[PDB]
Ligand binder design. Structure first.
Ligand SMILES: CN1C(=O)[C@@H]2[C@H](C1=O)[C@]1(Cl)C(Cl)=C(Cl)[C@@]2(Cl)C1(Cl)Cl
Lengths: 219, 216
């Protein structure tokens, strides 16, 4: 019954302000405090603070002063986390979580809200074929790849042979290089079916409505 | 502030086996009121953290019998008698005895399997990237185990620790191995200034690094 449904992903530029909602249900919204937690990519959970119930007081960790606010629209049992004057270090995922006073802990957590802060403008990726460079060679299998470079924002969807190829593939998380993202994906197939049987990566970027195919030819 | 230190960072286990992880506070968590506010949470890849144990040894509703929390003062332990696949993920301890509640850094419960050397492949800058004025050399070190691996890049026989971006996949669903991608990005001028480009992988499966190179 208890549900904490958070608002969708956010894309903002430094200096802007963001409002992340947390819609609660299945419980008496006015009897529990709402906590907010920040988690930077692959890092530990960090408690930002919370907003007491019947009283309406908010506590903030030292790291979250001046630009942060907690408030709620009880008539709709929703809690908000407002971040003004966005900084790059504000980029992370945010969690809303119910607090249970007697135990001094958060019990039910929201699904999480990802926040990206960047001055970069939408940009479709550049897709390059990664075929072997005339060295090494024989054995039972061959690895091929595709470099998806210079796109924004995330994400990108990579498939091989329209998704028919699945077991031999490894698509890696994107990394930021100067306001822009780059990811790579490898596929390993038996050396007998290639180039005999075509192998092509398909890169799609919704953000910019982009769909690109790149057949891997002996480069 | 209360520092919560968890160990290990990664705990490889075989499903069905027992698992035990530690959480230590820089200050005793025993409150003046007698309670010890040390809790545990399970965060699954992509999912919201889940409430597991409260006040040291009390199981939150719905939490399986196999989860047991113990310890006192500054030292705590969370034990899983028989690990199931649903238990894999990152465990976090959290204290709220001392103003400004703090979390431990986490312990990732992963799968143990036999050692596996990485499969390393190097790819020179594509022709269309070059034409466009760019030059990235990519190296794949795939399906290896354990997860600890270091990759070095040498340009004309000398190490380059710059222009390098690395990315790592999560443990593989069907074979429990790990994979890494490392790409050396350099200016086209630079690329056209050197001949040899090598990708060196160091893994416990070998006394000698695995080297993949090409000379343009
Ligand atoms: C009301 N309220 C609070 O005072 C805080 C939060 C909350 O929901 C949590 Cl989740 C609970 Cl409950 C208590 Cl009490 C603390 Cl101090 C912690 Cl433990 Cl951070």
């Amino acid at each position: 019954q208890i549900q904490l449904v958070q608002s969708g992903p956010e894309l903002k530029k430094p200096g802007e302000t963001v409002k992340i909602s947390c819609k609660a249900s299945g419980y008496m919204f006015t009897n529990y405090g709402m906590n907010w937690v920040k988690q930077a990519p692959g890092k530990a959970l960090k408690l930002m603070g919370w907003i007491n119930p019947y009283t309406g007081e908010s506590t903030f960790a030292d790291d979250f002063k001046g630009r942060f606010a907690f408030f709620l629209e009880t008539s709709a049992t929703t809690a908000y986390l407002q971040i003004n004057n966005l900084k790059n270090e504000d980029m992370a995922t945010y969690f809303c979580a119910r607090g249970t006073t007697i135990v001094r802990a958060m019990d039910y957590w929201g699904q999480g809200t990802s926040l990206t802060v960047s001055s970069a403008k939408t940009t479709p990726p550049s897709v390059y074929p990664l075929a072997p460079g005339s060295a090494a060679q024989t054995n039972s299998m061959v690895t091929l790849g595709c470099l998806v470079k210079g796109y924004f924002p995330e994400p990108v969807t990579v498939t091989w042979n329209s998704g028919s190829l699945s077991s031999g593939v490894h698509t890696f998380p994107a990394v930021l290089q100067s306001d822009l993202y780059t990811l790579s994906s490898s596929v390993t197939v038996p050396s007998s079916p290639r180039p005999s049987e075509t192998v092509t990566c398909n890169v799609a970027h919704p953000a910019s409505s982009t769909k690109v195919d790149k057949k891997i030819v002996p480069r | 502030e209360l520092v919560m230190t968890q160990t290990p960072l990664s705990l490889p286990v075989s499903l069905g086996d027992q698992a035990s992880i530690s959480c230590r506070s820089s200050q005793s968590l025993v409150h003046s009121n007698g309670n010890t506010y040390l809790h545990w949470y399970l965060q699954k890849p992509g999912q919201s953290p889940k409430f597991l144990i409260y006040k040291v040894s009390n199981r939150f509703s719905g939490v399986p019998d196999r989860f047991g929390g113990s310890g006192s003062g500054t030292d705590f332990i969370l034990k899983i008698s028989r690990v199931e696949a649903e238990d894999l993920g990152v465990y976090f301890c959290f204290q709220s005895t001392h103003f400004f509640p703090t979390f431990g850094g986490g312990t990732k419960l992963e799968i143990k399997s036999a050692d596996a050397a990485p499969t390393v492949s190097i790819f020179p800058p594509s022709s269309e990237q070059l034409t466009s004025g760019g030059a990235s050399v990519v190296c794949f070190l795939n399906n290896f185990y354990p997860k600890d691996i270091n990759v070095k890049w040498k340009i004309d026989g000398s190490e380059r620790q710059n222009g390098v971006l690395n990315s790592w996949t999560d443990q593989d669903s069907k074979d429990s191995t790990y994979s890494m991608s490392s790409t050396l990005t350099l200016t086209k001028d630079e690329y056209e200034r050197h001949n040899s480009y090598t990708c060196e992988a160091t893994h416990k499966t070998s006394t000698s690094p695995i080297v993949k190179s090409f000379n343009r």
